[PDB]
């Protein structure tokens, strides 16, 4: 309800990049600018999530697992 919020944030943003035809390389690189979207309170936690979870989020999304389930699958939400 903290690492969960940043996790829901990232999932959506990555599925936007998926829906806009970004290669996987391009999304890994778009992780640095993603946490810029957020206020400073959250940024640090955000970069903690990108660092351990980012590419695992992307891969699961790329397996066609529902965006909805990603964060709880990874034990960041729920």
Swiss-Prot record:
Q: Which residues are glycosylated?
A: 21
Going by the entry's taxonomy, the superkingdom of the source organism is recorded as Eukaryota
Task: List the disulfide bonds in this chain.
Answer: 4-77, 7-71, 35-46
Q: Which residues form the Saposin B-type domain?
A: 1-78
Q: What is this protein called?
A: Saposin-C
Q: Which residues of the full protein are shown?
A: 312 to 389 of 524
